[PDB]
Amino acid sequence: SLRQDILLNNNWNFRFSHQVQGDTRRVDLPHTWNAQDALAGKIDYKRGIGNYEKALYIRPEWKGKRLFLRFDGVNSIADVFINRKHIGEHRGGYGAFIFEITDLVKYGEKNSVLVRANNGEQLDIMPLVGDFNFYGGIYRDVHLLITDETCISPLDYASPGVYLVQEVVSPQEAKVCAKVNLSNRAADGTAELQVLVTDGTKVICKESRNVSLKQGADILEQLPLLIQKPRLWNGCEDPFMYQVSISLHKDGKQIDSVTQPLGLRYYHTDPDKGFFLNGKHLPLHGVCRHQDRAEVGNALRPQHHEEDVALMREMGVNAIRLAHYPQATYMYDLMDKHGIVTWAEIPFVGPGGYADKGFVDQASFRENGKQQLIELIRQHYNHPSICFWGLFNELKEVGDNPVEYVKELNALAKQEDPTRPTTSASNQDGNLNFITENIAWNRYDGWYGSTPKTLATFLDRTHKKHPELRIGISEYGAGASIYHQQDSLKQPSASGWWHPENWQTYYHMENWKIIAERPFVWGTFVWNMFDFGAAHRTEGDRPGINDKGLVTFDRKVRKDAFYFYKANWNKQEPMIYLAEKRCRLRYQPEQTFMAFTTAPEAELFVNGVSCGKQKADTYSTVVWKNVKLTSGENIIRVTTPGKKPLTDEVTVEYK
Amino acid sequence: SLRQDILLNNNWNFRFSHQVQGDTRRVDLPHTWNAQDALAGKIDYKRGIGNYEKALYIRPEWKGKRLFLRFDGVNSIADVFINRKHIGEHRGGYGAFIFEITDLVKYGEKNSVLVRANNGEQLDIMPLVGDFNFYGGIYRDVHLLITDETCISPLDYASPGVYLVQEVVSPQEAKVCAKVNLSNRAADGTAELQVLVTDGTKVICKESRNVSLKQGADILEQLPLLIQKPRLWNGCEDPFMYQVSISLHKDGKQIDSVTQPLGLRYYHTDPDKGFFLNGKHLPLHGVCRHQDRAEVGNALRPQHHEEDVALMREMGVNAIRLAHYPQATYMYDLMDKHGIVTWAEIPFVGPGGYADKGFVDQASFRENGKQQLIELIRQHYNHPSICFWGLFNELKEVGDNPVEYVKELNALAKQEDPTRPTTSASNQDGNLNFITENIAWNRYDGWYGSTPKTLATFLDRTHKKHPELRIGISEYGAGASIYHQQDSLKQPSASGWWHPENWQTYYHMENWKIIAERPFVWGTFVWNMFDFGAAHRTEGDRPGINDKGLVTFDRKVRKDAFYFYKANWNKQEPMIYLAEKRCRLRYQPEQTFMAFTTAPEAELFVNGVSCGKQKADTYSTVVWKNVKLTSGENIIRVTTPGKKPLTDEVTVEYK
Amino acid sequence: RLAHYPQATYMYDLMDKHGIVTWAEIPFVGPGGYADKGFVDQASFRENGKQQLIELIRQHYNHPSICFWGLFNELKEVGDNPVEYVKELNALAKQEDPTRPTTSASNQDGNLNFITENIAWNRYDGWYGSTPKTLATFLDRTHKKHPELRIGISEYGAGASIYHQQDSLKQPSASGWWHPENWQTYYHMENWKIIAERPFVWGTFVWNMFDFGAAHRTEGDRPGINDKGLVTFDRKVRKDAFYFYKANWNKQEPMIYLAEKRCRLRYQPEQTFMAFTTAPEAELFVNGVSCGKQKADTYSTVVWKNVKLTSGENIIRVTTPGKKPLTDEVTVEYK
């Protein structure tokens, strides 16, 4: 009677097609075959076909039901076979996809499921280029879905089949259109469709409709909902969601059901005053996050998403840009749950300072880009956290000019979802910046040359020249190795093998001050919350890594800048953090010590003797200058005021 | 006034897309990037995108002409850009392709030509699998073609635009339909089309037609030709060809012209008596040849084709199977010139003893297969040497079953060219063998197990059970290293690291005797004329090589079997060849010496002392038994009779 | 010169058999234009070097072909200075075998050149920069300044791919991916003329008879190869310079060889054809029509200038005099 969702992750037989003999090894999903070679900095890591095969017992009692194989993600092309007969293809590495196998299997026996995954280079599947790894394989879950022959359809771009369209939302009332896809393979007849909105045990809406479904029908039903005096999803202040059950009934029996969240809110972006959520100004304190991790590549487990979100909330993050592609359903779920305003985007990624192009002007590429956009929007439609749809990152006009195609994507986004604005992330001047509703730039003033001050100049000049633009900062950052430490502050070469941590700290303190004074900037996103994989990189403390994270690739170590942001953004958790603790060897005659704290002041101790109190500045920073160390070991301690104080401590050597 | 054909092979800038920085190196076409890694036996050799860029000066005086970039071959996908704007894509590694660039260039300046070549794995472009290397890149010539605005069209699958259809051919008369594609971009008006057939300075046909061509017209004209008492293209006996000039004229001025050969013949294949050319039985003494070579991979220069053909003619080859794909125009030209009956085929290649599949049942694969077949037939239509179109090699029915698709390809071949029969090369029993007009099998009785005798049993049983089949042998062979030698004859393990030359010799002598007695076998083709590259191989004297050649990979050394065939097939060139000369170390008490000769007998000398004469058998082999060597060095000499004899000699050591 | 190490007994046997005067050497090899050092000054290295020298001399003592023992190739004094150790090796060679002189192959000025009885230099004037003429200047100046030195040329050469061809003569970048065959031909003709006029040079050795393996190379028509051979790595193809030397050095075997046959595509308005022959003269034919005879010069070279080709295919033939002549032929395309 109930819909079943069966995980098919364990024990698949794997081999590369370049291994011609046919023998296989066991693997377990999520899986990528690029977790060792790409992460070792091998620039020509394996990009081609890997094959997964599993024997699936089709239970006799599933006869009469409908059966679907749903894939959460396979990078980048998947060809699926049942009993070695081809059933379909998916092109795109980040969107879910589904095939019905109801009439393709033999009931009561083992059937072969074969997936031939290809992450070889293509010129007709975005992303074509990018500063990250194109990890190959079935790197998200695989499900066997089992439903009634009359069901809420899972066949609409592999979405849940329900779109809760937020037409009008205010504190007085919300009008929602529940769009429901129905799929019928039963004999001609009827069913009753019910849409139930609840808050815990309390019933908020219950709307019903009798529907006549022809054999073979695949149709869209639209049920209007009205909620009086709604409780709004209000970011981290109150991430409230209703639950919606959508169900089908025949003769007073429920025969199918799906649940989706309903987090109601309204928003706008003001060119002069920034982002407003539910009628109130909201600074977007944002970071970016790639979907990979040390040692496992992009084969992330649920605890990895959970941990990433825990670290961001610890830091006081209230906004995120999930670059550079559609990410996991579970990850958008955590954004919903924790109230994090989210920018979600398609992988329409340009070259940046590197070679080749993000756009190749041929129908196959362009049609496939539209498919990946429709996938993004339909598959992730109901997540309240998503407040912006991103259409590109660092495209450029030279050669194949993407401006007209990006206009087509913008119009398609607005058609698919008029309830959210489009955005984009640019490193260019010119017409590419004037298509999406909001615009943002990737700025590295003070890292890739210049000084942080030119970010202030760029922001002010652009805002004055183009007062209609809603200006954001879609990336800003600096590299750091936790193993590169020096007593003095000196700007390093960005592309070199020396990325002292103190420069990243300096960079973020200076850039944050510029942002904090400019409320017309509707959101800013640190590049990046975590170090991440990019095989071609040859910089910092090891190849193959982009080290602009606030936290290391294995999520183990928070860099000093993490705590600068935590003090400023997470003000209600008491803390004190001494900066430059990893710089154990000191040689400067005049030592400077610096702490980040939520307290109004702090006290410094050197070798157990107080150096006195210093006040925190407006950026939660306390600084002591001309501190005198003695030759050899020195114990440095900082303490907040109060009867029960907080402390941080380190032993440094002075010579 | 004249059509120009300008080679664009020298000095291109190259880089891999996995090299992200943008710097390049000079390369010169023909080029493959897999001439070192695949040939070293690296099984995961580079399969992905390589980029070639060249500045092309567009001369001011070309304004008013039409300009085309014609590619003879790029493996396997090519995306072409002019001034970095995409102009088109080709999918398929072995057929020619063309783009007009007339209205895409700036006249009087340098224009960028960029080719982005991809040999990454695909499941929608045959060949999907195969016992050979998928060498990537622009491995054949690139041309700039310059024509009048009214021209014999080069735009019909990049063919010459002229199809000389051999409708009826006999010694009394030949009826030919000259099909001519015309392309017009001039203002509405007329031109005169002339088709001129000559034999040296003698005029055989001259047919003319006035044609009215609308602006933008792309049309087909058909001019009937009648040749009384023709001189026929008759294989190696008389490879005679007429020359055909096809020209366009305006106001008594020739404005365009193309030349094509006309080699007239008729043929049939008899299920009981074999192949008949021009009404006369012709044993097809065939070999196969791949288009690669030591050190250069498939980036063959003209002297490489010329040399390969010289070696085959030296051996008395009169038939060839140019496996496993469309090969170079120049190579089919040499077959025409030297009278070699040719099997040409599409790369519809199955796995053999290896994993995966030759057929993936999806529209993209199937449509692309049809395109590669149409390319093959239209591009190579006028070569008299081609007498069979091959549709597949070792497909199998399990999983995706290609039988119905192969029937579609057979019907398409017959539509495109009713003047040649279809054929195929099978390693299967069953329905796949009953589609093409002729059928052939790949047989390794005595190499991959069993004994040569079971080839005789298979041939006789099949012929008796299925008397309607025209049976051929599309492959037969055995491996040999010239560096593996042993005094005794012992069958080696096929997959092992020991391939003694004497077993390959034994294999071919025994298999040839079986074939020679069976005239119902219409043709047999040795696998292979030359050792060739197959990165995944781990056998013989080094990895990465299929060593079943009669001649080594560098074309330097002829193995003993080469001379067995030469004695039997090239009977009018006097020769004597002592076998087993490379086996320098002898230990058998009773030595056997063996020579291949065109003479009726030969004489053996050991240490300058005659051992007497022995008669050649029916297979041009002379054998001396129980020859007594003395400890240490022995000089062995064999001599033909006559006042001016031929000799072969070797020094062996006996111990 | 069987560089850069003791080679097979069977190879020295063939030198004995065929009468080839042989330089045999130990692998005491320096870096040349590359990094690191040929000499590391520690007892283990030095004692092992002496062992390899004693091995060379005792193992190959009886080969008449061996007339020189080579002690090093391109060592340099900077850092660990091998001069004193090379003197020790020289004294050891003379002790082990007073019946042969020592020699060495240098790319340096200074004291390293004054230890062995004969000395030789590796010279690439006209390949690694400069012009062949500076070889003549170096040889004459050294000989005048140091009249006691027995001066040889232990290496001279230029790279060539048989797949790199161009109608015009232009010096390529040595380290680049374009090594046109005609520059190697030019290089050897010019250097040979300089050597031939200087009998005080006791021996000269082409680097190299064959292309050979050097994994770190990234030049010519493929990586991993030193392409200065007169013959290709697989021993299949003789480059044009092979036949220049054959005409000059093997005078009693009649021959004619047309140069630049691999350069099939011609575009120069005025074509030059060049043949190497043992004959006193030869005749050129273009499309079956004689262009007349030309005399061979003192270096067995015959040259025809301002030859007129017609658009498209041209058949070029050269023939020696006599009732039974020798010929060489090629078809080129002119456009």
Ligand SMILES: O=C(O)[C@H]1CNC[C@@H](O)[C@@H]1O
């Ligand atoms: O250079 C960087 O670190 C960033 C520049 N903007 C685009 C990012 O993908 C890239 O990682």
Ligand SMILES: O=C(O)[C@H]1CNC[C@@H](O)[C@@H]1O
């Ligand atoms: O095993 C072999 O050597 C041959 C078997 N038949 C197919 C060929 O491609 C293959 O090379």
